[PDB]
Amino acid sequence: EAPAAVVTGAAKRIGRAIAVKLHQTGYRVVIHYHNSAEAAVSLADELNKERSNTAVVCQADLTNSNVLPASCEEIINSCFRAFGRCDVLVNNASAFYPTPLVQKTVETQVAELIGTNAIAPFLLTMSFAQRQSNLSIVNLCDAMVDQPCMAFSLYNMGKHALVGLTQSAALELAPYGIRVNGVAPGVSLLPVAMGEEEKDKWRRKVPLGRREASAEQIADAVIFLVSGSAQYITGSIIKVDGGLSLVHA
Amino acid sequence: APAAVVTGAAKRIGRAIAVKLHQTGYRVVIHYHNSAEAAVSLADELNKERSNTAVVCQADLTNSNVLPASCEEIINSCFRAFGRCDVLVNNASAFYPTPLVKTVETQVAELIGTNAIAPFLLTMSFAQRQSNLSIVNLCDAMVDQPCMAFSLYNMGKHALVGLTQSAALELAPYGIRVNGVAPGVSLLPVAMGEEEKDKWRRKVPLGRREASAEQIADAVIFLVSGSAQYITGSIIKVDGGLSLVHA
Amino acid sequence: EAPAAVVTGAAKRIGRAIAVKLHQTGYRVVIHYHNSAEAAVSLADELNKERSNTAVVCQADLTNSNVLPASCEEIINSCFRAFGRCDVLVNNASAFYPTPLVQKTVETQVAELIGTNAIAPFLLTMSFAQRQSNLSIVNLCDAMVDQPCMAFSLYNMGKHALVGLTQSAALELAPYGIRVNGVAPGVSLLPVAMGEEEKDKWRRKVPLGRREASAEQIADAVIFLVSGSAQYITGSIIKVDGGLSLVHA
Amino acid sequence: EAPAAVVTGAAKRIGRAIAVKLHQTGYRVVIHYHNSAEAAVSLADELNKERSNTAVVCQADLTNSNVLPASCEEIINSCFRAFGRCDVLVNNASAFYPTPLVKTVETQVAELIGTNAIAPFLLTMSFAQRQSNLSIVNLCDAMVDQPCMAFSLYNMGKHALVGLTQSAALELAPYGIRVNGVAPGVSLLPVAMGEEEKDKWRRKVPLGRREASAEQIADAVIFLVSGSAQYITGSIIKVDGGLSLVHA
Ligand SMILES: NC(=O)c1ccc[n+]([C@@H]2O[C@H](COP(=O)([O-])OP(=O)(O)OC[C@H]3O[C@@H](n4cnc5c(N)ncnc54)[C@H](OP(=O)(O)O)[C@@H]3O)[C@@H](O)[C@H]2O)c1
Ligand SMILES: NC(=O)c1ccc[n+]([C@@H]2O[C@H](COP(=O)([O-])OP(=O)(O)OC[C@H]3O[C@@H](n4cnc5c(N)ncnc54)[C@H](OP(=O)(O)O)[C@@H]3O)[C@@H](O)[C@H]2O)c1
Ligand SMILES: NC(=O)c1ccc[n+]([C@@H]2O[C@H](COP(=O)([O-])OP(=O)(O)OC[C@H]3O[C@@H](n4cnc5c(N)ncnc54)[C@H](OP(=O)(O)O)[C@@H]3O)[C@@H](O)[C@H]2O)c1
Numbered sequence: 001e002a003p004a005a006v007v008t009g010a011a012k013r014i015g016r017a018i019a020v021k022l023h024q025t026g027y028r029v030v031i032h033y034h035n036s037a038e039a040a041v042s043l044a045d046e047l048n049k050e051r052s053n054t055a056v057v058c059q060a061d062l063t064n065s066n067v068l069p070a071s072c073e074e075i076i077n078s079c080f081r082a083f084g085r086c087d088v089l090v091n092n093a094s095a096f097y098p099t100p101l102v103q104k105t106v107e108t109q110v111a112e113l114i115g116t117n118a119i120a121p122f123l124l125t126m127s128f129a130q131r132q133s134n135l136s137i138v139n140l141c142d143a144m145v146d147q148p149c150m151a152f153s154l155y156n157m158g159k160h161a162l163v164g165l166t167q168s169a170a171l172e173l174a175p176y177g178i179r180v181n182g183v184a185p186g187v188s189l190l191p192v193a194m195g196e197e198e199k200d201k202w203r204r205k206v207p208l209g210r211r212e213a214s215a216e217q218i219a220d221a222v223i224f225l226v227s228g229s230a231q232y233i234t235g236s237i238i239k240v241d242g243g244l245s246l247v248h249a
Numbered sequence: 250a251p252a253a254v255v256t257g258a259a260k261r262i263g264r265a266i267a268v269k270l271h272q273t274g275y276r277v278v279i280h281y282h283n284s285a286e287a288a289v290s291l292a293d294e295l296n297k298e299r300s301n302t303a304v305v306c307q308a309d310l311t312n313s314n315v316l317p318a319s320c321e322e323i324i325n326s327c328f329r330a331f332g333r334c335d336v337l338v339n340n341a342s343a344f345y346p347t348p349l350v351k352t353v354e355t356q357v358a359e360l361i362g363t364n365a366i367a368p369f370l371l372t373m374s375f376a377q378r379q380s381n382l383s384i385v386n387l388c389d390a391m392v393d394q395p396c397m398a399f400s401l402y403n404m405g406k407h408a409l410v411g412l413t414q415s416a417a418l419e420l421a422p423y424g425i426r427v428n429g430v431a432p433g434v435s436l437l438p439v440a441m442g443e444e445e446k447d448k449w450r451r452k453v454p455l456g457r458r459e460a461s462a463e464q465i466a467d468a469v470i471f472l473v474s475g476s477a478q479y480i481t482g483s484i485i486k487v488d489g490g491l492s493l494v495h496a
Numbered sequence: 497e498a499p500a501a502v503v504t505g506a507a508k509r510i511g512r513a514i515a516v517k518l519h520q521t522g523y524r525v526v527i528h529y530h531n532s533a534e535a536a537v538s539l540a541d542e543l544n545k546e547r548s549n550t551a552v553v554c555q556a557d558l559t560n561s562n563v564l565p566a567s568c569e570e571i572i573n574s575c576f577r578a579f580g581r582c583d584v585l586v587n588n589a590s591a592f593y594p595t596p597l598v599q600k601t602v603e604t605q606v607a608e609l610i611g612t613n614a615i616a617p618f619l620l621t622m623s624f625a626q627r628q629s630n631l632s633i634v635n636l637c638d639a640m641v642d643q644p645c646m647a648f649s650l651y652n653m654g655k656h657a658l659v660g661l662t663q664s665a666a667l668e669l670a671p672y673g674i675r676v677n678g679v680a681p682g683v684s685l686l687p688v689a690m691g692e693e694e695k696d697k698w699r700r701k702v703p704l705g706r707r708e709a710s711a712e713q714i715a716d717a718v719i720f721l722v723s724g725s726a727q728y729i730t731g732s733i734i735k736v737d738g739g740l741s742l743v744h745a
Numbered sequence: 746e747a748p749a750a751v752v753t754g755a756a757k758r759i760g761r762a763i764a765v766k767l768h769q770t771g772y773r774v775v776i777h778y779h780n781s782a783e784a785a786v787s788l789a790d791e792l793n794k795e796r797s798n799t800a801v802v803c804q805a806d807l808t809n810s811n812v813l814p815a816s817c818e819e820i821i822n823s824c825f826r827a828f829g830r831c832d833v834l835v836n837n838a839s840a841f842y843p844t845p846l847v848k849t850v851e852t853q854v855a856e857l858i859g860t861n862a863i864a865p866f867l868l869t870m871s872f873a874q875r876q877s878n879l880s881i882v883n884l885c886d887a888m889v890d891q892p893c894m895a896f897s898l899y900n901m902g903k904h905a906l907v908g909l910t911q912s913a914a915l916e917l918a919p920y921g922i923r924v925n926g927v928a929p930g931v932s933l934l935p936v937a938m939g940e941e942e943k944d945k946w947r948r949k950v951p952l953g954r955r956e957a958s959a960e961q962i963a964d965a966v967i968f969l970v971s972g973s974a975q976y977i978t979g980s981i982i983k984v985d986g987g988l989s990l991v992h993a
């Protein structure tokens with residue numbers, strides 16, 4: 001009776017807020033994680049305290065490799081194993097770090113940045129569709145893909161490829177009743193490693209409130225796109241950026 | 250309760266928007282141009298649900314020397330009736346072909362005046378008269394793959410995307426968010442024949458579902474809600490995937 | 497015979513550079529102007545000294561009004577009266593000034609900023625098509641239309657509408673063999689009234705050389721689009737912005 | 746004195762036209778190829794008959810793998826070894842075939858994302874590291890936002906190439922390297938395709954109801970590498986006869 005969702009990178013930050021808000025809406029959740037085992041299990045424990053048997057964890061590395069298709073098939077399979085269905089996929093996990101063009105091996109950088117941001121979403125989409133209502137996939141995009149950060153070529157390529165996937169999968173999966181959309185943050189929760197001065201630099205750029213989005217504000221757009229209020233929406237990407245992408249240099 | 254202005258609210262998409270805002274708890278101004286009977290019938294229905302929660306406002310939104318005063322009056326009607334104006338929905342729109350190969354300047358006044366200049370003037374008036382404030386502009390998901398011989402209409406819809414972006418930036422400091430909803434094929438022109446309507450329906454990837462005014466209104470309701478408090482300068486397509494479909 | 501071109505706002509600045517470059521390519525030109533009669537006649541004199549009977553002037557206000565259609569018809573007629581043909585239309589004339597949303601009448605600002613930037617290009621395009629080899633129209637667009645200057649709503653609306661005209665006219669006129677394209681500068685010749693301090697702030701934003709485009713660099717892109725090297729190009733807008741539109745806030 | 750350029754997938758079709766027009770403009774050329782050795786050598790012999798010692802060939806698979814970075818470094822090095830300089834890189838090579846959501850999938854990923862995006866990335870890195878008018882031109886696709894059904898990996902690769910074009914234009918602009926794209930709509934159609942199917946495509950094109958020639962695509966590439974485009978970076982020129990403007 002209750003629908004079920006997979007959220008990638010759901011242990012912390014935006015993915016956690018998405019998983020929590022889906023669970024609040026009535027979903028059973030698969031909390032995917034890679035390194036954040038403690039936080040994953042903690043979250044599943046909390047959700048299960050709320051409604052028993054409504055949350056599981058699933059560990060996987062989403063770096064590209066010849067075994068990534070099996071890892072992605074396993075994530076989707078974990079949903080069916082736990083809940084007997086899989087109604088929603090949220091592709092949220094993402095590696096992010098600079099890859100300067102002018103001077104980990106570069107092949108590892110490609111595997112991680114293109115794998116987590118683009119290839120794992122594609123394979124997760126394949127596995128979701130093959131295993132199949134209000135079914136839908138939501139991809140976490142980037143509102144700044146056309147005004148990218150200096151020296152983040154590979155990350156930017158991965159996020160552009162994720163827009164292409166959102167469009168192509170929305171076209172191809174529409175006859176199966178699967179809607180595919182994206183949510184594109186601008187600045188939301190800033191990197192843990194970032195200093196306060198640098199954080200404030202980014203905050204001051206945002207027209208609407210001179211502040212970053214909360215994780216919950218991003219989650220609210222995901223909730224809309226999976227909801228019955230979005231059943232004619234497919235192939236759309238909703239920027240949640242407080243106006244940041246409108247701001248010239 | 251908060252209050253909303255919906256332009257072109259007597260029929261079709263704008264009526265669906267007005268109904269859903271009302272259902273969410275807003276008081277509404279139902280703007281109309283030629284559709285007085287329909288506007289009053291809707292206000293009658295809404296007032297039966299909650300009395301003195303819906304009023305009507307007549308105005309022609311063709312561009313002219315008097316359009317700024319007309320737009321000011323629409324916003325003023327909200328403040329008079331309700332003491333505030335939280336939401337502006339720019340939905341009124343003229344649509345018809347203007348082949349390159351009514352005088353042309355009347356077509357300009359109507360196509361560019363209703364789809365762009367009236368939204369601009371209403372935005373200025375709404376901002377000047379100022380919570381969760383926001384404006385939602387009814388855009389068009391096919392602005393970059395336009396209908397043949399619809400130059401002026403397409404120019405007006407592009408101008409409305411520019412207004413969306415420019416107004417979002419400039420009003421962000423006032424806490425006013427400005428967003429768009431871009432339908433694809435929704436309620437077809439009543440005029441349009443049935444064979445041509447079916448031809449369109451067949452091209453929609455999600456076309457197993459019918460397009461409805463309610464679906465458009467649902468996107469409007471999200472963007473005015475507290476669930477969209479960080480969203481400004483965004484246009485949400487509601488087109489069933491149609492804009493993805495190559496020739 | 498030599499082909500002929502109309503260039504709007506061609507007395508000074510970018511429009512003059514486009515006229516000169518088309519003239520040096522072998523075109524006969526109509527130099528449209530509004531207020532700059534001395535500069536317009538002076539340019540026509542210089543071009544006619546290089547090749548006799550190859551340049552005329554044509555005066556017109558391109559503000560929107562009930563007479564603008566006739567003014568636009570007359571510009572195109574001027575080209576056919578002087579030269580017997582009209583192969584190229586360059587829509588360069590443009591008004592630009594702030595129109596703040598929160599505080600000339602506003603209806604005047606609308607007439608000027610939407611008239612010169614969008615309605616007069618539409619009417620000129622209608623007249624050019626109706627009066628009809630390598631025929632094309634080039635619209636001077638703006639590379640920063642999606643990252644606009646604060647308080648320039650009406651200017652921005654008119655430049656967006658010009659993108660819409662570029663696309664719509666390309667689609668509709670393709671069957672008649674008329675191509676319609678745009679050139680979108682970032683920062684090129686800065687306003688004459690701008691102080692050097694302010695000019696430098698803009699220059700410093702430009703990735704490629706930290707300087708504005710020369711008028712000739714903009715004209716080079718126009719010359720390509722009218723040439724036989726662009727014979728399959730229609731509905732395209734070429735940014736000529738040194739990377740400015742890629743730079744985040 | 747003469748500048749030099751690397752063109753990937755240069756033995757046939759669009760890449761061959763680009764190589765010829767660059768040579769005609771006065772460049773020395775590296776003709777990269779993967780499987781089309783006879784055609785690559787035929788072109789290099791033609792070009793060298795026109796002007797001695799102006800064309801070489803370089804073979805490489807541009808599928809993604811652990812050796813792809815070395816391969817791409819070797820292609821750029823081939824230009825420096827042959828000509829002493831490398832002024833232009835044209836990322837033209839491309840795999841294209843359907844990958845329906847409903848060869849192993851990881852081979853399809855390596856091929857479609859490697860040739861269309863990762864090789865251009867690695868070649869761009871190699872080009873920039875090794876450095877009058879330097880530029881890179883990436884062959885994009887005007888239909889990236891209205892994609893052919895069941896081509897998700899190809900479309901993801903071409904979108905990633907738009908991101909590379911923008912990100913590389915921004916990062917390389919301080920070194921005076923410009924990075925731009927040319928996005929065909931329908932140009933030379935696949936060799937297998939029957940005329941009836943080719944005509945279905947041709948009839949969709951507003952401007953002339955025909956596909957672009959390879960030379961038409963090449964002309965946009967020649968503009969972007971020229972002195973006439975010295976302020977243009979991060980731009981992608983659609984060469985598509987209006988095709989992308991046509992609704993369903
Ligand atoms: N935060 C923003 O300002 C912002 C801006 C633009 C776009 N976004 C997008 O929104 C989504 C959420 O952002 P966020 O800041 O919450 O992300 P985040 O904290 O940087 O990362 C999300 C999760 O990704 C997982 N991840 C990283 N590498 C992985 C790998 N190799 N295999 C599997 N999982 C891996 C990590 O899981 P473990 O912790 O379990 O290792 C991580 O917690 C991301 O897609 C991001 O690109 C965010
Ligand atoms: N498939 C679709 O329906 C579709 C597709 C794309 C975009 N849209 C956009 O969505 C919005 C609503 O669509 P719709 O089909 O419901 O619109 P519509 O029925 O065609 O027109 C809505 C209202 O516009 C008002 N209007 C027309 N000319 C006017 C003028 N000179 N002054 C004042 N009002 C005027 C009319 O009000 P009166 O009846 O009171 O005179 C009309 O009822 C429009 O902005 C439209 O462009 C709709
Ligand atoms: N310059 C830049 O950095 C830049 C950046 C982005 C876009 N652009 C676009 O590129 C084009 C050329 O730029 P620019 O700086 O050379 O333009 P500009 O000097 O600001 O204006 C060009 C001409 O427009 C004509 N004009 C102004 N109002 C008019 C009216 N009411 N009726 C008829 N003509 C009118 C004027 O002719 P008279 O002098 O004869 O009165 C003026 O010389 C414009 O479309 C502009 O928007 C330029």
Ligand SMILES: NC(=O)c1ccc[n+]([C@@H]2O[C@H](COP(=O)([O-])OP(=O)(O)OC[C@H]3O[C@@H](n4cnc5c(N)ncnc54)[C@H](OP(=O)(O)O)[C@@H]3O)[C@@H](O)[C@H]2O)c1
Pocket residue numbers: 753754755756757758759760777778779780781782805806807808836837838839840841856860884885886887928929930931932933934
């Ligand atoms: N033709 C069109 O209509 C059209 C439309 C849109 C975009 N484009 C783009 O324009 C470019 C030229 O198009 P085209 O039709 O001439 O291309 P094409 O003939 O399909 O392919 C170009 C060359 O790509 C090379 N290539 C394929 N797989 C490779 C691999 N694993 N490693 C190295 N090289 C490989 C091949 O070289 P070998 O022959 O030596 O093996 C092939 O000759 C492509 O980027 C394409 O995506 C073309």
Ligand SMILES: CC1(C)N=C(N)N=C(N)N1c1ccc(Cl)cc1
Pocket residue numbers: 093094095096142186187188189190191202
């Ligand atoms: C690093 C972080 C948080 N994480 C991912 N996965 N993607 C981003 N875009 N991020 C991000 C990077 C820089 C800034 Cl300023 C904001 C968010």
Ligand SMILES: CC1(C)N=C(N)N=C(N)N1c1ccc(Cl)cc1
Pocket residue numbers: 589590591592638682683684685686687698
């Ligand atoms: C004022 C000027 C020169 N002129 C027009 N018609 N359009 C612009 N965009 N301009 C412009 C405005 C600001 C800057 Cl910074 C550069 C050019």
Ligand SMILES: CC1(C)N=C(N)N=C(N)N1c1ccc(Cl)cc1
Pocket residue numbers: 838839840841886930931932933934935946
């Ligand atoms: C196969 C071909 C020629 N080759 C590549 N590398 N890319 C494309 N986009 N192509 C293409 C595919 C279909 C059509 Cl209709 C036209 C060109």
